[model samples]
Target chain A: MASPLDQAIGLLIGIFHKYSGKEGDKHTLSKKELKELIQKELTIGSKLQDAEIVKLMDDLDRNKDQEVNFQEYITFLGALAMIYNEALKG
Target chain B: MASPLDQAIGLLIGIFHKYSGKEGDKHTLSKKELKELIQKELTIGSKLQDAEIVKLMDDLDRNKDQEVNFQEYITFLGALAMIYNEALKG
Candidate 1:
């Protein structure tokens, strides 16, 4: 059986593909794919307004590309982890 | 309800604390705690010999502090996610 940590890591990767494959560029997340992933897979996602998602998409697209590749997605996760860590500490 | 992504992120933070609080600094992982965590929570970790783990500890201790702080741990997770992403693509 996979440990909880291993399962968590797998879920992270799986969640990305679950959305990325729904539309264009099977290996990356288009803006729409990203939006769907966030809205469906994150607690805070449902609360984000259109304007916030647009801003988030812009922030995550590090290379100014229209899509979010795996690297960019991981960077977003890293940032989220930092935020969660801070919340946990407080 | 917490989404899968939120649960995954929570698991990541929770796992760190589960081990980090076992001994020393409560907020950081000692070498022993890291070793135990890896062996128990990662697939590849079980295969790593002592020398390799020692080296990994050296590499992860970015500030030469001989301990793995939350930031360092998050960096490690980022690297792991990248590796998993590449494997999924292949």
Candidate 2:
């Protein structure tokens, strides 16, 4: 069986390939755009509660300017995958 | 606003405080018991999909024997918090 970490990594990679990694596509995304995309792809038909969206904004926006770039995105996803992998162990 | 990682950490700490770290509570957990407890606390009334549960098992079970210790558990939860925190950035 695949680990949750593996599954999460696959999911994130898939998301990048399908959306953000297109030829000539830029790597940065504004907070509103990121939230919209996440909603469209991952939270379709349901709004992430305001608090959750706020949390996302706060995490992704390192400068508190409400924007995120690819480097930050990958870094965050890496941490997420690690966590899921680790959490299941116990 | 609190980042997702912080929120996740707080949630995990709360869970540990409420359950796992009690006096006389042991640090190790069998796979079956872990699943039961996770279901009770996190997925109550809603069954984890078979595939997802399998993923969790694979991640948690380091040895083929299928059990997890406290060290493993904490390590995993910490990773989870980190991921959520990181992902919010992008």
Candidate 3:
């Protein structure tokens, strides 16, 4: 009985856990896990693929841990949300 | 054919505009609009509805524009995203 907005928020949370749980920390995205997430979830794998990911992993893993935690991943999602907002309000 | 993340992002964007367009600027949520959003889309009308929203509107409409812009809404969403993250990672 969730609304679309509610479901969307849940989906974003679930998507991160989906990838983050697959590897070492079981709560963060290792490099490979992040790559798999973008490559698979976003279809950017189909330059922007690896090229975009290289920068993203370098930038998003801000704590120098080489793993993207839930909070860190939230920042990336925030960035994407801004991108989507631009398209709408532009 | 969108991925779950893709669909989720689209849903969030759609939800914002659905309310934002209902009055005034056609790109922002006035107080009434935001209230309606919570009452309907989120079912919080049933204290947290007005109580939570009073603070949210006061805090989010940082520019004092009397309307919640997309950026403002994103900030609110980002806050929610963090709350969700904590529940998951805690």
Candidate 4:
């Protein structure tokens, strides 16, 4: 509904809810939720190993809460954004 | 060509280059360049000031390089994304 940048930011928030919505929690994503979100929504994670998913969960669950909240999820997206930014450089 | 998250991330890279493309630096955003971007692209900065811009760029410029590189730029976007995320929560 606004600039591409605004829309881009909005898209991130919505997609998080789209996955994190399924697990009974209203605002947090569990491991399965994260794995499905990554594997299905990001080509970068397509067919990636469970090991990778667990690694991400380990890093993302900053409080070791065993769940990735919206705050932690942003960190994940930030990392992914950097990955995409770097790849576009060349 | 991919998921919303992928397309959303792609849009960010494209828009950064779109604004940071000026000033002849290719990949870095000086103060004025950043000013133009936030003003033109995000409703949040549509009427912001030089002081505010400098404030943001200072936090973003990080290494005191006097310019915001892509790595720094992602942090700015990450901040914006969090703002959007929080607002959506309420």
Candidate 5:
């Protein structure tokens, strides 16, 4: 059996592919895909406004490719980890 | 209720504190604390040889303070996420 941490890591990557595979670019997430992912897979995701998601897409699509690749997605997870860390510490 | 993603992020942070608080520093993970965490909370962790863990400790302790801080821990998670990504894609 995988450890919880191991399973968590798998879930993070699995969630990305769950959405990334739904549209164009089987390897990366289009803006639409990203939005759908956040909305469906995250608690805070549903609360985000359209503008918030657009802004997040702009922030994460660092290569200006109009898509979120795995590295960018991982970076976003890093940011989320920081937020979660702060919340937990408090 | 938290989404799976939210819960995963929370687990990541929670696990860090679970071991980080056991010794030396309450906010950072001492080498011993990190070792204990890996052994208890990770499946691959137990398979790691002493030298491998030592090397990982060196790689993760970027500041060379002989401790792993939150930022460092997040970076480690990012690396793990990448490894998991490759494994999942394969």
Candidate 6:
């Protein structure tokens, strides 16, 4: 049986595959592709608009590095997962 | 074998028991007891002082609710877990 850590790793791998592969017109994402991946999963008013993009980019750029890496992206995911789990517990 | 969800639940219960129980005279923690708990586990310079308490309280009070229930507490824990996992991957 898979451990919790293994299962969590599997989940992350699945996420990477789905986001990074091109099943359609959208190109395959690179490790540095932050904005599009986030927009796909999280959108404002059910759409990835310009203002939302700007706001999210600013939020994701926590280190003020002008760009987000996998570490920062996963940090955001961690926060999102926490919010989801907390909401469920509530 | 427990699924990932089940394992996660067990981990959370363990955390609750560990922190909420008093092996010493720290007192049993309440659900709304945010400040004391955060201070206990997380402190600056290996001590739970005034400034560290203040900073954590402000950080944990996400809804600006001035208090935390199990929901908010677990939310923070989830974030902590994800950070731990990400750091391990790194």
Writing each residue's lDDT as its tens digit, candidate 6 over A3-88 gives 33234434443454455444332222333455555555453345323434444555645535454333344445544443443432
Per-residue CA lDDT of candidate 4, range B1-90, in tens?
A: 366777886787778878766645656776666656766777664533343354465564554548767645665665555544553344
Tens-digit lDDT string for candidate 3 (A1-90):
356656787787788877775654655676566656756786544332233444465564554547666655655655555554464455
Candidate 5 residue spans exceeding 4 A from truth: A22-32, A44-71, A88-90, B22-27, B45-63, B84-90
List of clashing residue pairs for candidate 1: none
| DockQ of each two-chain model | 0.44, 0.04, 0.40, 0.40, 0.41, 0.05
Query: Model 1, stretches more than 4 Å misplaced?
Result: A21-32, A43-63, A66-71, A84-89, B22-31, B43-63, B66-68, B81-86
Ten contiguous residues with the weakest lDDT in model 5 chain A: A45-54
Report the Cα lDDT for candidate 1: 0.63
The CAPRI classification for model 2 reads as: incorrect
Task: Give candidate 4's whole-model lDDT.
Answer: 0.63
Over 4 Å off, model 4: A22-30, A43-65, A69-71, A84-90, B21-30, B43-65, B69-71, B84-89
Error of 5 at B84 (Å): 5.5
Model 3, position B40, has a per-residue lDDT of: 72
Instruction: For residues B1-90, write the lDDT of model 3, one tens digit per residue.
Output: 366776787787788878776655655676566656655776544333243445455554553557666656655654555554454454
lDDT per residue, candidate 6, B3-87, as tens digits?
3433444444444446544423222234344554444444334432343334455464463644344444554544443443343
True contacts kept of each: 0.52, 0.00, 0.44, 0.47, 0.42, 0.00
Q: Per-residue lDDT for A57-84 in model 1, tens only?
A: 5565653557666656665665655554
Candidates ranked by DockQ? 1, 5, 3, 4, 6, 2
lDDT of each: 0.63, 0.44, 0.60, 0.63, 0.61, 0.42
Clashes of each: 0, 12, 0, 0, 0, 0
Among all candidates shown, the one with the greatest TM-score: 5
Error of 2 at A8 (Å): 2.0
Model 2 lDDT on a 0 to 1 scale: 0.44
Local error of candidate 3 at residue B36 (angstroms): 2.9
The TM-score of the first chain in every model comes to 0.62, 0.44, 0.61, 0.63, 0.62, 0.42
Better of 4 and 6 by DockQ: 4
Give the winner by TM-score: 4 or 6. Answer: 4
Candidate 2 residue B20 Cα shift, in angstroms, is 11
